[PDB]
């Protein structure tokens, strides 16, 4: 009867995911210019929620190094876009509702949870864009953080 009052923090087994992706380094801003190029390369045939895998992220400078990923069965057309399987992870999952650029309380809750359950966090982490109002408009955005743990 209760759903996403809190961050619904749990440990999940996430199986490998075939993605079309672009590796991006620069302002978290300039990533949104790319994520559409991924969709177009695979004729917009996603078979899962798009996500960003963060290898490096500084929220003080809001710049980082990341994979912009769209789960797909398709072969990408138009170079820059490649396909790989994102690896199996055992991850702390947190579900965030609303504006998603920083989500400091979510990452603090994940860190506190990890210490409580004696889990060791292992980058890289993912932000999964489950839902949102779409392209005709944010208090409705659903973003799942997946932070891998050491097994």
Pick out the residues of the known binding site for Zn(2+). 13, 15, 58
CA distance 46 to 137: 22
Is residue 141 near Na ion by the rule CB under 5 A?
A: yes
Q: Round to whole Å and give the CA distance between 26 and 66.
A: 9
> Taking the complex as a whole, how short is the minimal distance between the CB of residue 79 and Na ion, in angstroms?
32
d(CA 23, CA 64): 11
Which listed residue (65, 83, 90, 100) binds Na ion by CB under 5 A? Answer: 100
Contact status: 143 vs Na ion (CB under 5 A): yes
Start-to-end CA distance of the chain, whole Å, equals 32
Tokens of 12: 């999940």
- Residue 26 in contact with Na ion, rule: CB under 5 A: no
Distance of CA 115 to the CA centre of its chain: 22
CB of 1 to Na ion, least distance (A): 22
**Pick 93 or 143: Cβ nearer Na ion:** 143
95 scored as a contact of Na ion (CB under 5 A): no
Q: Which positions lie near Na ion, rule CB under 5 A?
A: 96, 100, 105, 141, 143
């Amino acid at each position: 009867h209760m759903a996403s009052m809190n961050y619904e923090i749990e440990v999940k087994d996430v199986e490998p995911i075939r993605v079309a992706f672009m590796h991006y380094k620069g302002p978290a801003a300039g990533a949104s210019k790319v994520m559409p190029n991924v969709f177009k390369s695979i004729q917009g045939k996603a078979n899962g929620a798009p996500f960003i895998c963060y290898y490096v992220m500084d929220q003080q400078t809001m710049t980082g190094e990341m994979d912009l990923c769209v789960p797909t069965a398709e072969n990408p057309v138009g170079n820059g876009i490649a396909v790989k399987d994102m690896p199996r992870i055992k991850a702390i999952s947190a579900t965030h509702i609303g504006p998603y650029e920083t989500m400091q309380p979510v990452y603090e809750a994940i860190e506190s949870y990890a210490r409580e359950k004696n889990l060791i966090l292992q980058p890289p982490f993912r932000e999964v864009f489950i839902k949102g109002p779409g392209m005709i408009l944010p208090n409705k955005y659903i973003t799942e953080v997946l932070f891998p743990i050491k097994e």
